[PDB]
Amino acid sequence: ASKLRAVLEKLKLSRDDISTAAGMVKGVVDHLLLRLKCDSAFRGVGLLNTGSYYEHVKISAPNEFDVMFKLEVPRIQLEEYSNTRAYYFVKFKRNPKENPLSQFLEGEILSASKMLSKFRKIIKEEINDIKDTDVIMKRKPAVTLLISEKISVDITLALESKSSWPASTQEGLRIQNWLSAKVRKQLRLKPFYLVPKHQEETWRLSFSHIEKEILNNHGKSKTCCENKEEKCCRKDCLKLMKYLLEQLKERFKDKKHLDKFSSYHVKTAFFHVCTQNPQDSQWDRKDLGLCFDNCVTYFLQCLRTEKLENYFIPEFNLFSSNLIDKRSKEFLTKQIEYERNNEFPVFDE
Numbered sequence: 001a002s003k004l005r006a007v008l009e010k011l012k013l014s015r016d017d018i019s020t021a022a023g024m025v026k027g028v029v030d031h032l033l034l035r036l037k038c039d040s041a042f043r044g045v046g047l048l049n050t051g052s053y054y055e056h057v058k059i060s061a062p063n064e065f066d067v068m069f070k071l072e073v074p075r076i077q078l079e080e081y082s083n084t085r086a087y088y089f090v091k092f093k094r095n096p097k098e099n100p101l102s103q104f105l106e107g108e109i110l111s112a113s114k115m116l117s118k119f120r121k122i123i124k125e126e127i128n129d130i131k132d133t134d135v136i137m138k139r140k141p142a143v144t145l146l147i148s149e150k151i152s153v154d155i156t157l158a159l160e161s162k163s164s165w166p167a168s169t170q171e172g173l174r175i176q177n178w179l180s181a182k183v184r185k186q187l188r189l190k191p192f193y194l195v196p197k198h199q200e201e202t203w204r205l206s207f208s209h210i211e212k213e214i215l216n217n218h219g220k221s222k223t224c225c226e227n228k229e230e231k232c233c234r235k236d237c238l239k240l241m242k243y244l245l246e247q248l249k250e251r252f253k254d255k256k257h258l259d260k261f262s263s264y265h266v267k268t269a270f271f272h273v274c275t276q277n278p279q280d281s282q283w284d285r286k287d288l289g290l291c292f293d294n295c296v297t298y299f300l301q302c303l304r305t306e307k308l309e310n311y312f313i314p315e316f317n318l319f320s321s322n323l324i325d326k327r328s329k330e331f332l333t334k335q336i337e338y339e340r341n342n343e344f345p346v347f348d349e
């Protein structure tokens with residue numbers, strides 16, 4: 001309760017410092033954006049979101065920065081890597097003007113592996129040219145860097161499609177009773193992205209932009225969190241959920257049980273709790289303890305039932321036995337139940 005606000009304030013202590021690191025990050029990205037716009041196929045490249053910390057909100061350790069590069073690919077033809085609902089092959093509709101991505105084609109399909117390797121090469125060729133800071137490219141996110149040994153920058157390359165969302169998403173983003181039918185309509189008119197996540201020809205759908213948008217305009221009231229009277233704890237509940245998983249993942253690092261779990265799981269579950277608790281009166285700042293519990297309780301029910309539907313792709317189950325093993329889900333359940341029933345000691349000093 002007061003224990004939870006102490007943790008959120010402690011999570012602020014680190015966030016206050018970031019100001020020096022954010023500037024060093026932007027200097028590298030912009031120099032890499034200019035070197036890419038030189039290339040024939042990467043002329044339409046650019047960063048997704050413009051804001052502070054450069055989309056750092058993933059890890060509560062303020063050193064890991066995640067940046068997304070986008071590239072508009074018009075007249076796109078998506079062919080589902082059938083029955084998966086989320087992974088697609090990239091085909092091209094009409095051939096009057098030859099597309100700059102011809103070099104990455106593997107027949108009709110656009111190879112993500114060929115598209116990545118050239119991208120990965122261009123910047124590695126540019127790192128040795130950098131005389132300002134010390135950049136170390138680690139390959140295992142499409143590309144990763146270690147700026148000044150302290151800063152870690154994970155670069156992701158995404159295709160942008162300004163067309164209608166795939167039929168698999170038709171029944172997703174069920175925000176109607178929370179954010180409204182008007183908002184759903186407006187969000188679905190926005191573009192969608194595809195990330196190289198493999199069959200080294202397949203790309204997975206990305207809605208990181210929609211997610212960010214609904215988190216920064218998350219109430220039923222348009223003035224939610226805009227004044228002292230309408231302050232909810234939606235954002236704090238997500239921050240605590242993300243922090244719980246980070247603390248447990250770090251606790252059991254050399255045990256590989258939680259390797260399949262990520263903050264995406266905790267963000268998905270959170271949006272499902274927002275859909276079931278659509279009223280701003282269900283997220284009052286004074287009720288933080290119970291709201292966080294509602295999030296913990298719902299996550300525990302997802303683990304036990306082995307059902308965590310993708311919030312955009314409802315037939316895609318993130319907790320299927322094909323994605324995460326029963327033992328792994330049962331192991332996370334045991335750890336979270338211990339936390340819940342012991343007043344989250346993993347949050348203590």
Ligand SMILES: COc1cc2ncnc3c2c(c1OC)C=C(C)N3c1ccc(Cl)cc1
Nearest residue numbers: 086205206207259260261262264310312316
């Ligand atoms: C929009 O749809 C998705 C977005 C994602 N954004 C991040 N990570 C995602 C997704 C997934 C998606 O659904 C198809 C699915 C999975 C398994 N993961 C994921 C989760 C945990 C770990 Cl360890 C690695 C990857």
Ligand SMILES: [Zn+2]
Nearest residue numbers: 219224225232
């Ligand atoms: Zn709010």
